[PDB]
From a paper:
Hantaviruses deliver their tripartite genome into the cytoplasm by fusion of the viral and endosomal membranes in response to the reduced pH of the endosome. Here we present the crystal structure of glycoprotein C (GC) from Puumala virus (PUUV), a representative member of the Hantavirus genus. The crystal structure shows GC as the membrane fusion effector of PUUV and it presents a class II membrane fusion protein fold. Furthermore, GC was crystallized in its post-fusion trimeric conformation that until now had been observed only in Flavi- and Togaviridae family members.
Nevertheless, in both PUUV sGc structures, one molecule in the asymmetric unit assembles into a homotrimer around the crystallographic three-fold axis. The protomers adopt the post-fusion domain arrangement, resembling other class II post-fusion structures. They associate in a parallel arrangement with the fusion loop placed at the same end of a stable elongated molecule. The last residue visible in both of our structures is T1076, which lays ~30 Å from the fusion loop. The most notable one is at the membrane proximal part of domain II, close to the fusion loop, where E770 forms a salt-bridge with R902 from the neighboring molecule, thereby stabilizing the trimer in the membrane-proximal region. In our crystal structure we observed N-linked glycans only on N937 whereas N898 is buried in the trimer interface with no available space to accommodate a glycan chain. In contrast to other class II post-fusion trimers, where the glycans decorate the perimeter of the trimer assembly, in PUUV GC the glycans linked to N937 are tightly packed between domain II of one protomer and domain III of the neighboring protomer. Interestingly, R1074 side chain at the N-terminal of the stem is inserted into a negatively charged cavity at the same protomer. The main-chain carbonyls of G883, D884, K893 and C894 create the cavity’s negative charge and lead the stem to a canyon formed by two adjacent protomers. Triangles area for pH 6.0 and pH 8.0 are 52.4 Å2 and 114.1 Å2, respectively. We did not observe any significant differences in rotamers of histidine residues between the low and high pH crystal form.
Author numbering:
A (entry chain A), B (entry chain A), C (entry chain A): 666 to 1076
């Protein structure tokens, strides 16, 4: 049946004016001009001009905050009598602290010489992190898009459009196809910028998410809402000796995740960025790595036999019915779309979830004549995004905001 | 030397009837019809019909079972006298439990007031998981294949064949090439379905495999063979106080892997599925994500100059000699093939490992005239799979089953 | 503006002598011969010969050493009096050991019957690994390149060149384009060879790097500099009983990472290798997996309208100014290049970082007429590599060595 998702052309190669076929780095732009033969005139020439922008990476991201370095500290506070809750402890002022209480445990083989208590008091053990310093900014990739602006001019008619890395642009007599390739980044990668965005960063595959312990990548994060402190990898001990104050011991890791990373820094992957652009839910940049190459094919055919394979009689109207799920999420939001099809018995097409600035996901819709209900998934966006059901360049007149994502550590 | 692995055509573009070149979403089908000029007749027309199915993902998988939620529980059982083995404990009835025994350790600074024992008895500490509930079904990806059914009709001759995502189909006068792209899934990804397959799921990159501790993704799994219980991340302590029964303490993680995941659910990647088909060793589905696009090129040339580049004089016969390794495995099985070559001094070709329904791997064989011994690797399959050495559409007359895979946790 | 990075051709398809378009396995070579029509003579024919090598994988690697199996051992050494430093312990001779000291802690509820000490002596607890045996060799992937040697002969002129997997080769009348595909390996993957390189190996996504605990993949590594021993996942305990020598206990993992891996071996991905070649900073091989296919397109056009799209008037000279960063690193080294442009107002081109044998990275340089300062990133190489700024086939006359990478565990 009908579909408008085939983006390309049918041609008779005998009737083709020009074909360009080449490899181009993702971070390279390209310009091409040529005077083509006027078949009707054969005196005055028809200009052809092609412009391809550099490929721009658009990563929907989660702002994870600032990764922090810190120094590990362990302190003992002993009281012969009294519950642990009775006393204040110096570590309770720290950015991060964890306290283990040995309450009502005094005994004459573990007491200082001035303490005759038995089953009393408190040995309070405190681990606290201080000298907290931001070492960089951290982003988690929600999704990736790779686009070039493509401008075609043949005679006096120009068409410019943003084209994704494995898509084609088709005009009256011109087809430009991009064939993507290698992807350096993957969804759920974590990017760490140790300095300004322009200086590039490090890719981490195993940034701590469901359990963060001191020593992990991402163990200590500073966010606008506050510190997010790690758990401890190791365990406390109350060392006892006759006529001696108890001594807190900790047997686990005492070196921050940042210092452990730096010690073996060259185990990780760097990436570099040019022209970075930061937005509410996204980072855009051009990767100066010229080893990443796309394949480009351009056809010009001013002949009646040139076919736009996306052309169908089918027409659709869209309305955004409901939403659930979250913005800024790799799980995403689910948009419910009412899609009405005319002029065709059936129509396979692509329905997109877009806000006023950007699209966040597209679903193949198998439509039948009349009304259809289509669920589509979007990933990314922010709390102000009004998500709409869209097709080609047209969107529904109303949009819906999604809920806030769930990105909480349990402790 | 000769090879039949080049799937494509040589043509004179002047002698080409038609070329289609376009981008198509993996989840889109496409149909194209055209009446082509009869060069011998030029009155009656020759029909051309192209049909491309939607691309189907075939993932060989490991059925990891059901991921379970649970509640953490800690209990103390003290006996003044008697070995720990002498007594039964209530946690010994649980789906998962871990017990730490403090045996023959009684002393007058750690005993209840009715216990004068010294170096006797037992403080038994039990961690047990209860309220076990399945939260979803889990599959590990062994391998991935992406195929479309491609049908070509020119005049009265039709050819339909399954074509992989970076392969070509060649008939007498027609070539259809697919150029694959982005892959959302990777081998060793773990897929979690929280509900029916049709509702999609979550991708996990770090599902616990060699060490599973309570709190990890995949910590508690229910399989047909029984529960697979996690180890503990943390350590026990016997808290002592005069004239008091010992109290078991546990300092580690007490929150299940499921609850930790849900708390930060939007850190993970969702995927959606249509038309899912479950089999003994595999899951097949169509991904409704229309942002994944393949490149398609179609050539029609009813001219004598159209060359099938896969044509050679070389002929082979195959026999399956032996096997080792495992089914259902990302390491795979190794099939030993005796391949006999005639009509050519040398022949580079592809030898496949297939059962009666499916192929599981292909190896480039550098053959010389006469008999050859070729080792090929297959991944996936099940205990009933009779694996055969195959070439093109022909297989050896005998096959061999592989051994069961090793997928055991140590404790 | 001008760029030489577009590798391909502009043609009039009517003026094309021949087009080949086909899919080819990465591990397949291919040969094609044809006698083409001489347009000037039309009696004697012009030979065309195409040869494509098998695709070679070049992985820049880090030699991580040998992964070791071992047996866990725990021993107690008690002394009624004396500091722990006073005594030698048998575990101090082991390849790996970790010692926990309970110093000055004697008491009459934890002493052997011959020890009346109070707050004296030492219970020394030693974990040591013995029966250390190498189980395989380990390499971490720094970067990946996929190349074919491509030879073109038309008449008496031959051109052979190494072509990357998404690049094109252009001669006077011939264009050969490669379109890459699926990549089985990723940067930062860890490869384990349990035997000779020819027997293949296992891919690990989560080899321990910043924290290695006994039981992890990569926990125990033997390098030329010495053993790199893991930390412990678990904690010690001094078990006390009246009239009994203290007993050291360890509650954590006691099974090596190798044994845990082997127990669930079929959870991991195997890969196979042919014609492996080992060098100071790299491993090269051909993957016999024939399911990995590239797309190949060949155009021959002996017509004046055939355009080399890489041709520009722009000319550059290079000098290598300075370097920082490290060899053998996925973070890489940063080479500072002085690039001088003539014949053009502006020129977008690719500047490479190469030593005498190999290139390690390329950067898109946006040059303006006159002198430019360009920073480029290279990954890989070794301590003897003299890295140079290069363009096309030309390099600066001087090069600079980089510093040694930081690949240290903290303990
Ligand atoms: C490509 O990306 C890498 C990774 O980000 C870049 O390495 C980074 O380079 C910056 C600047 O050279 C380093 O910043 C710091 O600067 C202070 C001066 O304030 C300096 O004293 C410190 O020693 C420190 O190096 C940053 O640490 C470094 N990051 C890493 C992970 O090595 C690289 O420069 C980029 N290459 C380009 C843009 O050509
Ligand atoms: C695309 O895939 C995602 C991920 O699986 C889908 O999200 C999932 O949606 C289902 C159904 O809406 C959720 O199921 C559960 O249903 C009960 C009712 O019995 C409901 O009360 C619960 O609140 C729960 O949501 C499932 O939790 C959810 N999974 C995740 C990880 O969020 C999504 O709906 C799919 N989009 C489509 C098919 O358009
Ligand atoms: C493709 O690669 C896999 C993974 O390396 C290969 O499996 C490996 O096969 C070798 C040789 O068969 C195994 O070596 C060992 O040999 C001793 C004899 O000295 C044998 O007694 C042991 O049982 C052991 O198997 C190696 O263990 C095995 N590795 C794994 C991870 O299974 C496979 O053979 C390759 N297939 C080819 C080259 O066709």
């Amino acid at each position: 049946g009908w579909t408008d998702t085939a983006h390309g052309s049918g041609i008779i190669p005998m009737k083709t004016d020009l074909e360009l076929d080449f490899s181009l780095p993702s971070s390279a732009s390209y310009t091409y001009r040529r005077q083509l033969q006027n078949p009707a005139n054969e005196q005055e020439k028809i200009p052809f001009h092609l412009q391809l922008s550099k490929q721009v990476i658009h990563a929907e991201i989660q702002h994870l905050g600032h990764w922090m370095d810190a120094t590990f500290n362990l302190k003992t506070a002993f009281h012969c009598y009294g519950s642990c809750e009775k006393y204040a402890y110096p570590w309770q002022t720290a950015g991060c602290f964890i306290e283990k209480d040995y309450e009502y445990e005094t005994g004459w083989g573990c007491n200082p010489p001035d303490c005759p208590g038995v089953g009393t008091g408190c040995t309070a053990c405190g681990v606290y992190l201080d000298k907290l310093k931001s070492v960089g900014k951290v982003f988690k990739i929600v999704s990736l898009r790779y686009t070039r602006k493509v401008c075609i001019q043949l005679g006096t008619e120009q068409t410019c459009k943003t084209v994704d890395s494995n898509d084609c642009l088709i005009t009256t007599s011109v087809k430009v196809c991009l064939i993507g390739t290698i992807s350096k980044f993957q969804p759920s990668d974590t990017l760490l910028f140790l300095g300004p965005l322009q200086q590039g960063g490090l890719i981490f595959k195993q940034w701590c998410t469901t359990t963060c312990q001191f020593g992990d990548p991402g163990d200590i994060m500073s966010t606008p809402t506050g510190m997010k402190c790690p758990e401890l990898n190791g365990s406390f001990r109350k060392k006892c000796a006759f006529a001696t104050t108890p001594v807190c011991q900790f047997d686990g890791n005492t070196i921050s995740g940042y210092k452990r990373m730096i010690a073996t820094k060259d185990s990780f992957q760097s990436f570099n960025v040019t022209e970075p652009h930061i937005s509410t839910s996204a980072l855009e940049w051009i990767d100066p790595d010229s080893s990443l190459r796309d394949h480009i094919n351009v056809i010009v055919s001013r002949d009646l036999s040139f076919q736009d394979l996306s052309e169908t009689p089918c027409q659709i109207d869209l309305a955004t019915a409901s939403i659930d799920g979250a913005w800024g999420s790799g799980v995403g939001f689910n948009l419910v779309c009412t899609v009405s099809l005319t002029e065709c018995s059936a129509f396979l097409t692509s329905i997109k979830a877009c806000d006023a600035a950007m699209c966040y996901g597209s679903t193949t819709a198998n439509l039948v004549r009349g009304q259809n209900t289509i669920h589509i998934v979007g990933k990314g966006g922010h709390s102000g995004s009004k998500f709409m059901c869209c097709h080609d360049t047209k969107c529904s007149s109303t949009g819906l905001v999604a809920a806030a994502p769930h990105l909480d550590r349990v402790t």
